[PDB]
Design a protein around this motif. Structure first.
Motif, PDB file in Angstrom:
ATOM      1  N   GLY E  76     -10.507 -23.744 -25.268  1.00 30.13           N
ATOM      2  CA  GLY E  76     -10.728 -23.030 -24.202  1.00 30.13           C
ATOM      3  C   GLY E  76      -9.452 -22.927 -23.255  1.00 30.13           C
ATOM      4  N   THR E  77      -8.327 -22.662 -24.082  1.00 28.62           N
ATOM      5  CA  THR E  77      -7.087 -22.474 -23.308  1.00 28.62           C
ATOM      6  C   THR E  77      -6.792 -23.775 -22.602  1.00 28.62           C
ATOM      7  OG1 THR E  77      -7.788 -21.442 -21.286  1.00 28.62           O
ATOM      8  CG2 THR E  77      -7.336 -20.038 -23.168  1.00 28.62           C
ATOM      9  N   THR E  78      -7.395 -25.056 -22.517  1.00 30.54           N
ATOM     10  CA  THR E  78      -7.282 -26.213 -21.716  1.00 30.54           C
ATOM     11  C   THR E  78      -7.496 -27.463 -22.890  1.00 30.54           C
ATOM     12  OG1 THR E  78      -9.478 -26.337 -21.140  1.00 30.54           O
ATOM     13  CG2 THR E  78      -8.291 -24.902 -19.606  1.00 30.54           C
ATOM     14  N   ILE E  79      -7.648 -28.489 -22.386  1.00 32.01           N
ATOM     15  CA  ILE E  79      -7.853 -29.625 -22.950  1.00 32.01           C
ATOM     16  C   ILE E  79      -9.360 -30.036 -22.961  1.00 32.01           C
ATOM     17  CG2 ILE E  79      -5.659 -30.593 -22.416  1.00 32.01           C
ATOM     18  CD1 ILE E  79      -6.986 -32.162 -20.269  1.00 32.01           C
ATOM     19  N   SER E  98     -10.658 -24.624 -14.693  1.00 36.16           N
ATOM     20  CA  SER E  98     -11.284 -23.481 -15.098  1.00 36.16           C
ATOM     21  C   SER E  98     -10.262 -22.468 -15.544  1.00 36.16           C
ATOM     22  CB  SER E  98     -12.072 -23.139 -13.899  1.00 36.16           C
ATOM     23  OG  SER E  98     -11.123 -22.686 -12.810  1.00 36.16           O
ATOM     24  N   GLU E  99     -10.648 -21.162 -15.886  1.00 38.06           N
ATOM     25  CA  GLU E  99      -9.988 -20.186 -16.363  1.00 38.06           C
ATOM     26  C   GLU E  99      -9.114 -19.604 -15.644  1.00 38.06           C
ATOM     27  OE1 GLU E  99     -12.591 -17.249 -18.143  1.00 38.06           O
ATOM     28  OE2 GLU E  99     -13.290 -18.583 -19.704  1.00 38.06           O
ATOM     29  N   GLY E 100      -8.957 -19.865 -14.184  1.00 42.12           N
ATOM     30  CA  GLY E 100      -8.259 -19.251 -13.162  1.00 42.12           C
ATOM     31  C   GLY E 100      -7.480 -20.171 -12.283  1.00 42.12           C
ATOM     32  N   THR E 101      -7.309 -21.385 -12.761  1.00 45.59           N
ATOM     33  CA  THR E 101      -6.634 -22.437 -11.871  1.00 45.59           C
ATOM     34  C   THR E 101      -5.246 -22.362 -11.969  1.00 45.59           C
ATOM     35  OG1 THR E 101      -6.710 -24.095 -13.403  1.00 45.59           O
ATOM     36  CG2 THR E 101      -8.702 -23.933 -11.956  1.00 45.59           C
ATOM     37  N   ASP E 120      -4.207 -23.607 -17.737  1.00 46.30           N
ATOM     38  CA  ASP E 120      -5.108 -24.209 -16.862  1.00 46.30           C
ATOM     39  C   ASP E 120      -5.265 -25.687 -16.837  1.00 46.30           C
ATOM     40  OD1 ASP E 120      -5.470 -21.305 -16.067  1.00 46.30           O
ATOM     41  OD2 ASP E 120      -7.113 -21.141 -17.291  1.00 46.30           O
ATOM     42  N   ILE E 121      -4.481 -26.304 -16.023  1.00 45.35           N
ATOM     43  CA  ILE E 121      -4.271 -27.977 -16.370  1.00 45.35           C
ATOM     44  C   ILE E 121      -4.095 -28.359 -14.826  1.00 45.35           C
ATOM     45  CG2 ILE E 121      -3.365 -29.845 -17.175  1.00 45.35           C
ATOM     46  CD1 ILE E 121      -4.885 -28.808 -19.129  1.00 45.35           C
ATOM     47  N   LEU E 122      -4.802 -29.526 -14.483  1.00 47.83           N
ATOM     48  CA  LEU E 122      -4.473 -30.476 -13.606  1.00 47.83           C
ATOM     49  C   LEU E 122      -4.070 -31.665 -13.756  1.00 47.83           C
ATOM     50  CD1 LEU E 122      -8.042 -29.756 -11.732  1.00 47.83           C
ATOM     51  CD2 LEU E 122      -5.973 -28.934 -10.991  1.00 47.83           C
TER      52      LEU E 122
END
Lengths: 85, 64, 92, 131, 164, 57
Positions: E76-79, E98-101, E120-122
């Motif tokens: 999902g474009t993330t981890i 999420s998808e917009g972060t 999108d990663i924190l």
RNA sequence: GGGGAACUUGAGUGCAGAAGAGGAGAGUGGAAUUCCACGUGUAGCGGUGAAAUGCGUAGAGAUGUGGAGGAACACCAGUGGCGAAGGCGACUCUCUGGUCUGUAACUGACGCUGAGGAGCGAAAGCGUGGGGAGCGAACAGGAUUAGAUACCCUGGUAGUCCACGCCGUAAACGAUGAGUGCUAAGUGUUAGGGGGUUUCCGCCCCUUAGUGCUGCAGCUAACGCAUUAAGCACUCCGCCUG
RNA sequence: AAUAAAUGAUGCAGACAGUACUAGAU
């Protein structure tokens, strides 16, 4: 040695082979502490024997607390028998 | 090398054994080392005790 | 069990040596110390010199006492001139 | 002493995984048997067996390496330690790695995993995590 | 396995530190180059290089990074899950977003995540701010990630059996 | 000093040859030569563990 | 978590053995130093990089005998041993502490930690009364230096020792708190046990507690640690925030 | 008739500045 222990065991033996006998261990520790103080009243500078006596007294106190928490009847009986006041 | 007490299965030195103490002590009188005598640690300690008692009882010399 | 070995000065006659031996034995038995064994090596040359002699008489005695006749024998030998050296050891 | 059997069990398992061992021996308490059966039904372990002996009872665990060289149990971690107890409610039941792992939770009705507790609407001691 | 370097790459440097070597004559200055090479489809790598010149060191670092590429999951474009890297006193956590972060990280971690294709990663660094150790810990944390299908195959279960 | 044993019917240096060798097994070279100045108990103890093991002598 | 009932693996008692510089007290010892007395004996002795201060013709040193007194215990001696720590090294004895080995007979959780508190506590130091052989702060003298209130040399008080009391500090360090469990190996070593032939001597294997070296994983900033952890975890205590 | 390898302890050298000093870009 080998006489006081046997006599105390024969005296405090609740069963034919009761040797754990918290009461027996307490009596043995009491007689050992008395024999130790007998000589400490003269060799006041033997601090290692004093540490050993402190260890024996700690064992005695733990056993007395366990006996009081387990059976107050036997605890009071041991008290009346030994005079550990 | 080989130890003597183990080879012989002997017991407490019985310091009275003046001949044994002599042949185990140096010609000068000094106590021979363990690496040379071939004995174990326990037997070496007992040897020291026995030779000291002997020297105290005039069974072996202090100086030569 | 205990063992006792002592040295007697050489310049002593046989009768005097025996008298001293019996005296010290009686001293030991002052409390009831049974003499379980005795041995006399005899005349042996001392490894080193002492007060006035190079040789002496060696005497061995086996005893089972309560550590009182031991002290008696010790204080008596240290005082008496008949004995020169002595040591008491436990046979345990 | 040892102050807890469960944390030492988990650490023994972790050391076994690190060394790539195949067996273990544990005093096998009831809760230990439960956790081992949960791990078994969860696919973390090949097989587990109980050995009821005279002394206390023993349990054997057979670590799982499904592929060439991979540690199934990558890591473990205990939470409800003896001195800092952790209790989670039904709505606060956590999920391990977005539901990828699993966390054991003793609930009012038997011992269950995070998902089982979430389904049954219960909660209790969060006593371990798994990754 | 080792990933081949035959791919379109967005090589982008991070920092160029100047080091000096002491000699009888005096200090000898050399340039150290840090570079992160990767593509936005889930493949990235880190390399370094040293030389008495800037462009030569950059080229050497790029060539080295080409040989040290690594794959990263792109769920999902993330981890798929959060993880922390602890390479050499450098602690960096990575949380899914999420998808917009958007990508949120300090310079080097941000560059690594962007060049890897993640959007999108924190993130948050909890240790030294050294770029080398930052990159190493990020790479370690990304390597320690696990895919859902891979975990399902490993634990002998189905994907849905784990996701629900 | 080597010993009290006497040797004759040799040369002058033949005696010194055995003197210098037999003097090794006596404290004349170590016991009577170390105690020329004091040594603290700590260093005194460490000296044995050093020498008797390293085999520097 | 509380209460009730059972169990032994934890814990402790006993059984038969093992080692140890474990402690307090009493007695003994022979090397060695100093002094004293005597016989032999002359011109030096001692000392430094060199020299001098020092002792010696009222007879030194050296040599030989004897006596007097005081401290420590050569060789054994070895990261060997014991002790909670400091620390403990001649021999004999009285009174004593703990530890290890097979425990299974015995009680059956009686266990760990531990603020505060009590006790102990290197050396040095202080008070009382003794004692004083060597060593030796302060001190005197002789040297070197521009200077030497020091490094060197000659003497030398207190101290070092003994009984009582007080002080309670050290790089009091393994610069690593106590307890438990798990985590490859080779390797000597102390005290034991069991076995595979041998009555043995001895070889091998296994198993206990302790003591040392090299080393996998793991940890670490690196140094390095690594079954005696600085690895993987739990409980309690003390401490840290340029 | 033969024939030995040693021996070691070196005295002296005190100070030097306040403020100064090199860069590099896909």
């Amino acid at each position: 040695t080998q006489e006081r222990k046997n006599q105390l065991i024969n005296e405090f033996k609740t069963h034919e082979s009761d040797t754990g006998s918290p009461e027996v261990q307490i009596a043995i520790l009491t007689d050992s502490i008395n024999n130790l103080n007998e000589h400490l009243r003269t060799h006041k500078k033997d601090h290692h024997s004093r540490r050993g006596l402190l260890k024996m007294v700690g064992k005695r106190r733990n056993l007395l607390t366990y006996l009081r928490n387990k059976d107050v009847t036997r605890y009071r009986e041991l008290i009346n028998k030994l005079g550990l006041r | 090398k080989v130890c003597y007490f183990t080879s012989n299965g002997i017991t407490h030195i019985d310091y009275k054994d003046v001949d044994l103490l002599k042949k185990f002590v140096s010609e000068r009188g000094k106590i021979l080392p363990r690496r040379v005598t071939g004995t174990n640690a326990k037997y070496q300690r007992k040897l020291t005790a026995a030779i000291k008692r002997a020297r105290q009882m005039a069974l072996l010399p202090y100086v030569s | 069990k205990y063992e006792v070995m002592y040295i007697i000065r050489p310049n002593i006659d046989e009768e005097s040596k025996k008298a001293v031996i019996e005296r010290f034995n009686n001293v030991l038995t002052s409390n009831g110390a049974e003499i379980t064994g005795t041995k006399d090596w005899g005349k042996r040359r001392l490894a080193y010199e002492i007060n006035d002699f190079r040789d002496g008489f060696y005497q061995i005695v086996n005893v089972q006492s309560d550590a009182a006749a031991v002290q008696e024998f010790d204080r008596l030998a240290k005082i008496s001139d008949d004995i020169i050296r002595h040591i008491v050891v436990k046979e345990e | 002493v040892m102050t807890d059997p469960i944390a030492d069990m988990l650490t023994r398992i972790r050391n076994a995984n690190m060394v790539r061992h195949e067996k273990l021996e544990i005093p096998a308490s009831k809760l230990k048997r439960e956790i081992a059966e949960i791990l078994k039904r969860e696919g973390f372990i090949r097989d587990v067996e109980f050995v009821e002996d005279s002394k206390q009872g023993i349990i054997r665990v057979f670590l799982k390496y499904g592929q060439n060289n991979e540690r199934v149990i990558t890591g473990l971690k205990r939470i409800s330690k003896p001195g800092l107890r952790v209790y989670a409610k039904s709505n606060e039941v956590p999920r391990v790695l977005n539901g990828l792992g699993i966390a054991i939770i003793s609930t009012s009705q038997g011992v269950l995993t995070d998902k089982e507790a979430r389904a049954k609407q219960a909660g209790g001691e969060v006593l371990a995590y798994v990754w | 396995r080792i990933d081949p370097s035959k791919l379109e790459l967005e090589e982008r440097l991070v920092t160029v530190n100047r080091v000096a070597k002491v000699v009888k004559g005096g200090r000898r200055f050399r340039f150290a180059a840090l570079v992160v090479v990767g593509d936005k489809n889930g493949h990235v790598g880190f390399g370094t290089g040293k030389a008495q010149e800037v462009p030569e060191a950059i080229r050497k670092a790029v060539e080295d990074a080409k040989k040290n590429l690594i794959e990263v999951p792109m769920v999902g474009t993330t981890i798929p899950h959060e993880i922390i890297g602890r390479f050499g006193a450098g602690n960096i956590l990575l949380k899914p977003a999420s998808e917009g972060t958007g990508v949120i990280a300090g310079g080097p971690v941000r560059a690594v995540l962007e060049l890897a294709g993640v959007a999108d990663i924190l993130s948050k660094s909890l240790g030294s701010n050294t770029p080398i150790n930052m990159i190493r810990a990020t790479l370690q944390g990304l390597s320690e990630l696990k895919r859902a299908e891979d975990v399902a195959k490993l634990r002998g279960k189905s994907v849905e059996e784990l996701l629900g | 000093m080597s010993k009290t044993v006497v040797r004759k019917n040799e040369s002058l240096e033949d005696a010194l040859r055995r003197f210098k060798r037999s003097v090794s097994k006596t404290g004349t070279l170590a016991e009577a030569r170390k105690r020329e100045f004091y040594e603290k108990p700590s260093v005194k103890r460490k000296k044995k563990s050093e020498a008797a093991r390293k085999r520097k002598f």
